[PDB]
Write a protein that binds this ligand. Structure first.
Ligand code: MG
Ligand code: MG
Ligand code: MG
Ligand code: MG
Ligand code: MG
Ligand code: MG
Ligand code: MG
Ligand code: MG
Ligand code: MG
Ligand code: MG
Ligand code: MG
Ligand code: MG
Ligand code: MG
Ligand code: MG
Ligand code: MG
Ligand code: MG
Ligand code: MG
Ligand code: MG
Ligand code: MG
Ligand code: MG
Ligand code: MG
Ligand code: MG
Ligand code: MG
Ligand code: MG
Ligand code: MG
Ligand code: MG
Ligand code: MG
Ligand code: MG
Ligand code: MG
Ligand code: MG
Ligand code: MG
Ligand code: MG
Lengths: 129, 61, 384
RNA sequence: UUGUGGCAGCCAAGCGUUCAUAGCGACGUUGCUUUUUGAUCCUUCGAUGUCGGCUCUUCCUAUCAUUGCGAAGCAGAAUUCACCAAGUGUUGGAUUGUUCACCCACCAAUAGGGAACGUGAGCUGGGUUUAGACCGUCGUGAGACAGGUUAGUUUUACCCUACUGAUGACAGUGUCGCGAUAGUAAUUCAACCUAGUACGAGAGGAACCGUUGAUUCACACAAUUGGUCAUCGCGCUUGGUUGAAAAGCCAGUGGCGCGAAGCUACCGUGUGCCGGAUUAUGACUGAACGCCUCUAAGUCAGAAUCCAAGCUAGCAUGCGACG
RNA sequence: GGUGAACAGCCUCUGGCCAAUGGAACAAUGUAGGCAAGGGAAGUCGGCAAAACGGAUCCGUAACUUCGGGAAAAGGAUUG
C-alpha cells in the first residue's frame, strides 16, 4: 500500500483543521492502525487516519471524537526520490469513519501520499504537492 | 540527466539530494542543503547574501 | 509480583557474548554447500570497504508504488583487487569433523604475503618458506609435491585454496602485509577441484570469476569499535527518570531475589562494537573491472565522464583505482576495513533477489561536506 | 492447614421450541491450587528496611490473540466448547497514592499469574508510620481515632560471589584451520487480485496461491535529512582593555548565524534463514472378533512445537595441516 | 576607571596573588553547564527540574473593591 514516512505527530498534538467545516483546530487523541509498545506515544503521519477532537471551533463539532486525516506535516520526510519534502504547518481534515470528506474543500496544499490513498480527499484537494 | 535549480542559492541540485519546503501559499522551494534552508527560514534575502547566484546575477559577476 | 506491563526484551541473546572479536578478518563460518553437478568455481572473496555513496535507479516492480519510478538508494563501494592463489588445502571427514589433510604452497610467494607470517617482519631474516620453495628446484621435490597432490585428489572431500589480497595496490591503506584466508572451491569432482586450484596457483582471480551482477552476497567483517560503553547505548534499555540518585543511564533491577545471582541475560555495561557479524542478502548492483568502459561511474543516462571515486577521494580511504563492487545498503566496519564476500547459503528465488538493476546516476559530489558538484572539472568551469 | 478466595471433575431434574449431555447442568458429590482472607505462632524483636509506581529479567498455564485441529442447534460471516500447544505478543491515556476499580481509543489481543505479596547500599517518598498543626466524634483532663487535611533527613560498597566485559600461563614460535559445547530471533497485521465469487430466499459474505507494504524486535551502518560545536573554523556583536587603526585578548564556552569531521536517530538507511522428526488431528493396511475397526505388529500426512541448518562465543586447560 | 538607574553583573588601574600534589589518557557511571529536529506535560502523586518573560519609552489596562488598590494587570509597538 503506502510507504513508511517519518512519524511527526504524536498524541496530544494540536493541528490546524484545513477545511471549511467550522473547526479551527484538531487535537489528536489516537491513531488508527497502530499496534502499541510500552511507553511509546502513538504517532501520526500524512495519510494516517486518526481520532481527533476539536478544541477551538464550531460548538456543533466540539466534545466528540471523530476520524480525521493528516494532510500537512512539518516534520521533514524522505520521499523515495531522495528529497526530504515537508510543509509549513500540521493540518488535517475531518472525515467520516469510511473516509468520505465531511467538509467541502481543503485550504492549503495537500500531500501526494495522502491524496493517492484517500480518493475523496484527493478530489476535494486544490493543490496536490 | 534532470538537474533542478535551488530557489535560494540558484545552484543545480543533482538527483538524490535536496530539501523541498512547501510554503502555505502552495509554492515549492527547493534548497540544496541545510545552509540555504536556514538562511531562508531566518528571513534573509538571497539577493543580498554575497555568495548566492541571485546576488551574482544582480551585480553581473 | 508479575510484570505489570509486558514489553519485548531489549537486545538479542543470540549474540552473546559480545566482546572484542578475536579476529580482525571476517571468518567464513559456513561455506556454500558443495554441488558436484555445477562447473568448478570459488565461493568467497576479499574486499575492502571504501566508502558509501548513493544512486538513483528505475524500479521495475509490478504492483509497487515505485514501479516505473526512480528511487534513491544508499550503496557501498568495496574496492576489491583480484586475489592471488598461493596454496591449496585439503579436508577429510572424520568422526570429529573435518581435518586439514595436508597443504601445498606455491613456489613463489609475494614479498607481502610472506609478511603475514611474521609479527616483526623488519628485524626478521625474512626466511618464511625459503627452505620450502626449494622443494621445487629439485626432482625429488617435484616428486614429493605431485605425491601430495595425488593424496589430495584421492582422499580429500573439501578442497580450499589459500588466497591473499594484494594489500599494496591500495596506497590509501597504510598497510603492507596482506590478508590471507581460505576460499572453498565448489563444483566438480575432487580431481577437478584440485586440478583447478593447482593450475591456478600464483595467478590472479578476478571478482567476476566469483560473483555475477544482480547476485546476492553476504558480507562478513568486524563492526566498528565503540569501546567500553554504558548499558543504555549497548543494549537500548530506557533511561531512568531525571531525578534518580546515583545516576540515570543504567538498569534499575538486575534480577529478582531468586535466583540469588545476576542472570546472564540482564543488561550490563561492557564492550560495544568491534563484534563479528555476518549480515546476509546484500545485492550486487555493479562490478567495476578496471580497464574498460564498465569501470567508470557513467550510467547509460548520465554521460559526465567521471570515475567511481568522489571528489577529493573517499574519506579515510582514498581513491579507488582497482576493481570494485557496489552493494546496496551499508557495510560492517569503518572505512579501510577488510570484508569477506561470501556467496549466499540460501536459494535466491524471490523477486527482490531477481530484479535486474539498471542505474541512472552515480552520485560523485564529495562526501566530505555538502558536495555540490560531480566533477572537479565542472567545479573549475563553474568558478573560472 | 485451605474454612474462605480461585479452579476442575462425577451423576443427571430440567433448560436447551422436539432433544438430559451442541451448549449448560439444579438437588447432591469428589477433588486440585497457594496470588486473596482466616487459623496457628515454628524461625526472625543485640532491627531481614514495611504499600504503590518506574526499570529490568526470568519462569508457570488454569490459552486472550497468534500456528495446526476436532465438535455445533458450524449455510456464509461471526460466535461458543474442547484438544497438541507457553514460541511470540498482550498498548496510549482521564481520575485515585492506590493493587483493584472504572471510562476514552487503538488493537490480532488489550489473559491470568509466580519469582522473600521479584525489585529502596536501583530510584521515588504520593500513601502509611515519630515529632508541628487544624477540623470532627469521644474523654472533665492529659489525650485517643482501622476518621479527614497539611509539612515532614531515604546513609555505606572499595570486600566475596554472581554478572558484564579485559589481559593471560600451561609442546618453541607463527599463519591457517576443525568444531565439542553453550547462547539463538524473528513476530504479527494490512491492502490488491482471488470476489461481491463460494455460501445464501435475501440480507449479507469468506478463504488458498499470488503481489505490495507495514507493526514490534534484532543486527549493522551514516550517502542523503536531522541532531550536536570549544574544529574556539569563518563571520557578526555587547562591555572593558592594549594612545588610535589593524590585530587581538577577558567575561570559566561572552552572545548570535552558519558550521565541516566524528558520533547519532524508526527522526535516516539496509538486512533478518533452507531441512529432518513428530504432538493434536485425520488417515493406510490390518487383526484380535469369518464382519467392522487409525493400533494390536507395521505404516502415512501433519503445527508459531522439537532437533538440526544458519548467526555469536569457542582457554574444550581439546585437536589438525604447514612454515 | 567604563558600561549601567547603581556599592548589580562584566572588564581594567593602585595594592595582592597564581596557594590549594603533579604527569599521561578522554572509556562507562557520575557532579556542574549547555544544545536538540516533529509534538508540547502525553511523563510524574505533582509542570519536580529546565526553558520561557525580564531593562526602558510610548499606548492600553478587566472582574472585584475596605474606593487605598488590583496594576509592573492583561494586550501591543519601539530600542543599534
Ligand atoms: Mg508507561
Ligand atoms: Mg547537517
Ligand atoms: Mg511488580
Ligand atoms: Mg502478563
Ligand atoms: Mg541502534
Ligand atoms: Mg534524591
Ligand atoms: Mg559526509
Ligand atoms: Mg481451598
Ligand atoms: Mg471452596
Ligand atoms: Mg514464636
Ligand atoms: Mg524483628
Ligand atoms: Mg539480627
Ligand atoms: Mg537485605
Ligand atoms: Mg541490616
Ligand atoms: Mg494446557
Ligand atoms: Mg535490594
Ligand atoms: Mg509524606
Ligand atoms: Mg504528627
Ligand atoms: Mg468536647
Ligand atoms: Mg488519625
Ligand atoms: Mg493510630
Ligand atoms: Mg543448541
Ligand atoms: Mg553532520
Ligand atoms: Mg550613564
Ligand atoms: Mg559595581
Ligand atoms: Mg526539543
Ligand atoms: Mg502533568
Ligand atoms: Mg497525566
Ligand atoms: Mg502514566
Ligand atoms: Mg494524578
Ligand atoms: Mg520549578
Ligand atoms: Mg489579578
Amino acid at each position: 500500500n503506502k510507504f513508511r514516512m517519518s512519524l511527526g505527530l504524536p498524541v496530544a498534538a494540536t493541528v490546524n483543521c484545513a477545511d471549511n467545516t467550522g473547526a479551527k483546530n484538531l487535537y489528536i487523541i489516537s491513531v488508527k492502525g497502530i499496534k502499541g509498545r510500552l511507553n511509546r506515544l502513538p504517532s501520526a503521519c500524512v495519510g494516517d487516519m486518526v481520532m481527533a477532537t476539536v478544541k477551538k471551533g464550531k460548538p456543533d463539532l466540539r466534545k466528540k471524537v471523530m476520524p480525521a486525516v493528516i494532510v500537512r506535516q512539518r516534520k521533514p520526510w524522505r520521499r523515495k526520490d531522495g528529497v526530504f519534502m515537508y510543509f509549513e504547518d500540521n493540518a488535517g481534515v475531518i472525515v467520516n469513519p469510511k473516509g468520505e470528506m465531511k467538509g467541502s474543500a481543503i485550504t492549503g496544499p495537500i500531500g501526494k501520499e495522502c491524496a493517492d490513498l484517500w480518493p475523496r480527499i484527493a478530489s476535494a484537494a486544490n493543490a496536490i504537492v | 540527466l534532470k538537474t533542478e535549480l535551488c530557489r535560494f542559492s540558484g545552484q543545480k541540485i543533482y538527483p538524490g539530494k535536496g530539501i523541498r519546503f512547501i510554503r502555505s501559499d502552495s509554492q515549492v522551494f527547493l534548497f540544496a542543503n541545510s545552509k540555504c534552508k536556514r538562511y531562508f527560514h531566518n528571513r534573509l534575502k538571497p539577493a543580498k547574501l554575497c555568495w548566492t547566484a541571485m546576488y551574482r546575477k544582480q551585480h553581473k559577476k | 509480583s508479575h510484570r505489570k506491563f509486558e514489553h519485548p526484551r531489549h537486545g538479542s541473546l543470540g549474540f552473546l557474548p559480545r566482546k572484542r572479536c578475536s579476529r580482525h578478518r571476517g571468518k567464513v563460518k559456513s561455506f556454500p554447500k558443495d554441488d558436484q553437478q555445477k562447473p568448478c568455481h570459488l565461493t568467497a572473496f576479499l574486499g575492502y570497504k571504501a566508502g558509501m555513496t548513493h544512486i538513483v535507479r528505475e524500479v521495475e516492480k509490478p504492483g509497487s508504488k515505485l514501479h516505473k519510478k526512480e528511487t534513491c538508494e544508499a550503496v557501498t563501494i568495496i574496492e576489491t583487487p583480484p586475489l592471488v592463489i598461493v596454496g591449496l588445502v585439503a579436508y577429510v571427514k572424520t568422526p570429529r569433523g573435518l581435518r586439514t589433510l595436508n597443504s601445498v604452497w606455491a613456489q613463489h610467494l609475494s614479498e607481502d604475503v610472506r609478511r603475514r607470517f611474521y609479527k616483526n617482519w623488519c628485524k626478521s631474516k625474512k626466511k618464511a618458506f625459503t627452505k620450502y620453495a626449494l622443494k621445487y628446484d629439485s626432482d625429488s621435490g617435484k616428486k614429493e609435491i605431485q605425491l601430495q597432490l595425488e593424496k589430495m585428489k584421492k582422499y580429500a572431500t573439501i578442497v580450499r585454496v589459500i588466497a591473499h589480497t594484494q594489500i599494496r595496490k591500495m596506497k590509501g591503506l597504510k598497510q603492507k602485509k596482506a590478508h590471507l584466508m581460505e576460499i572453498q572451491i565448489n563444483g566438480g569432482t575432487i580431481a577437478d577441484k584440485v586440478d583447478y586450484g593447482y593450475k591456478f596457483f600464483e595467478k590472479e582471480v578476478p571478482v567476476e570469476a566469483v560473483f555475477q551482477k544482480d547476485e546476492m552476497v553476504d558480507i562478513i567483517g568486524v563492526t566498528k569499535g565503540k569501546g567500553y560503553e554504558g548499558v543504555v547505548t549497548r543494549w537500548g534499555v530506557t533511561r531512568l527518570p531525571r531525578k534518580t540518585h546515583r545516576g540515570l543511564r543504567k538498569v534499575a533491577c538486575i534480577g529478582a531475589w531468586h535466583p540469588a545471582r545476576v542472570s546472564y541475560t540482564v543488561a550490563r555495561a561492557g564492550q560495544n562494537g568491534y563484534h563479528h557479524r555476518t549480515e546476509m542478502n546484500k545485492k550486487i548492483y555493479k562490478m567495476g573491472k578496471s580497464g574498460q568502459e564498465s569501470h567508470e561511474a557513467c550510467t547509460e543516462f548520465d554521460r559526465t565522464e567521471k570515475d567511481i571515486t568522489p571528489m577529493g577521494g573517499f574519506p579515510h580511504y582514498g581513491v579507488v583505482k582497482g576493481d570494485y563492487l557496489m552493494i546496496k545498503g551499508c557495510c560492517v566496519g569503518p572505512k579501510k576495513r577488510v570484508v569477506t564476500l561470501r556467496q549466499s547459503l540460501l536459494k535466491q528465488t524471490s523477486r527482490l533477489a531477481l530484479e535486474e538493476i539498471k542505474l541512472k546516476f552515480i552520485d560523485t559530489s564529495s562526501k566530505f561536506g555538502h558536495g555540490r558538484f560531480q566533477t572537479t572539472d565542472e567545479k573549475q568551469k563553474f568558478y573560472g
